[PDB]
């Protein structure tokens, strides 16, 4: 029976609502939970879902080299799978393995409609409107490591105000955009969910990069390639598309 | 040195235009040739480019189990890599390995502008406008296997008209759209290149599926994971985007 680590994140993973108490895997629902169930049907495994304790996706500490979040769970073999909106990135791929992508996306900007802001460059050239990202995720790492002037500029701004502009979760960032003059750097798939529910909000500019979400496994795990094959079947049958429609003004 | 199989297909791989005759790797240019060059630098290998002899991408004969095209070259261990617009697919992943995607795309429709045709369903429910795809490619195979009624019906139409409506290459399909009442089922990245050069053509409807192009290797090859990591590096530093812009350019 596989241990599956995951993280709360609408509409990928949420606590299911019921008038009565819920237990075990039945406590969860969402795109990624449907995915996991489909994978289990194809590959024939049983599983137990566990929310990652530190509530983080996974990044490496620049001082002591320690990983955290779901990535660390995999490295340490505390979980067999990570099934979540987990970005496949160069630094992660060096320490854990990934199925091929079940969704493709990119970093973009969440802000309000009807403003003069039309791009990342517009944000970088000013300081009145604050902007930030989720702490310890792929988006933050992209800016921290970027050698592109605009993004390097944006990282200087964010890192000099880490405490005030970086947030612990997408939900926290979305709330900042809704209640203050703030633009949030986040993934395009998730922006699409937000903007279908918050009609005053919109994506600003296009995609800043491109990346996929993959199922994570410890490095060398035979499940990575098996899950790739199952994902390809699910995509080709139209199932992933139906799941997207179900979960996603 | 590695042997690299590939296929001619604008703007991924082209014969370089020249008055002088060119030899060896010098003969080729394109998005996929730049990709290959970048990978060679990162991974530190040299290589010989060879066009796949049978001119096919790769499909399995549903009677005798035999594969052809670039997939076959890899299976037979005749090539170390296939660097081309080669779709990562369920059936192929069972017989060869792939890097993670350097490009993401979907099946869509290439047709003329100004008509009421707005979706695959609109094509499926009539016969006056013929439609088809590249023979023995991932696009045709998607239709051949789909349980979706609309796509199953389109397959019945195409398979029963194999000789007239399935073509040997994107190029032939594009010419057919331009010269006759015909809609061509083809990959969206390639449609984008075409519609930027032909202002009377357009994509019809959205993407019908989603897939990626990856570098193919024999199953079990150490190069699959190594190339994944190199692709991730190229993406993250902005090079894949610059490469697309260069070759795609109303
Ligand atoms: N999905 C991201 C977290 C959210 C973000 O960074 O925008 C990751 O895998 O780290
Ligand atoms: N790129 C496709 C060929 C073109 C198509 O099928 O539309 C393949 O890998 O088979
Ligand atoms: Na890895
Ligand atoms: Na494989």
Numbering used by the authors:
A (entry chain B): 432 to 544, 555, 566, 667 to 799, 804
B (entry chain A): 432 to 544, 555, 566, 667 to 800, 804
Paper quotes:
Desensitization of these ‘non-NMDA’ receptors involves rearrangement of a dimer formed by neighbouring ligand-binding domains (LBDs). The LBD is a clam-shell structure comprising an ‘upper’ (D1) and ‘lower’ (D2) lobe, with ligands bound between the two lobes, and the LBD dimer is formed by contacts across D1 lobes. Specifically, in KARs, additional contacts are formed at the dimer apex (grey surface), including a chloride ion bound on the twofold symmetry axis and two sodium ions bound on either side.
In the third mutant, R775A, the second basic residue forming the anion binding site was also truncated to alanine. Truncation of the side chain had the opposite effect, attenuating both the rate and extent of desensitization. Responses of GluK2 R775A to Glu and KA exhibited slower rates of desensitization compared with GluK2 WT, along with steady-state responses of similar magnitude to those observed in GluK2 K531A. The interface-anion also appeared to be absent from the R775A:Glu and :KA LBD structures. While electron density was visible above K531, anomalous difference-Fourier electron density maps indicated this was solvent rather than chloride. In addition, for R775A:Glu, the region of negative potential extended significantly beyond the cation binding pocket, potentially masking the anion binding site from the solvent. Whereas the sodium binding sites can be seen as two discrete regions of negative potential in GluK2 WT, the negative potential extends across the dimer interface in R775A. The surprising point remains that this loss of chloride is the only change apparent in GluK2 R775A, a mutant with attenuated desensitization. Comparing the interface conformations in the three apical mutants with those of the equivalent GluK2 WT complexes, movements were observed with K531A and K531A-T779G, but not with R775A. A possible explanation is that in the apical mutants the charge balance in this region (zero, counting 2× aspartate plus either 2x lysine or 2x arginine as appropriate) is actually more favourable to dimer stability than that in GluK2 WT (+1; 2× lysine, 2× arginine, 2× aspartate and 1× Cl−).
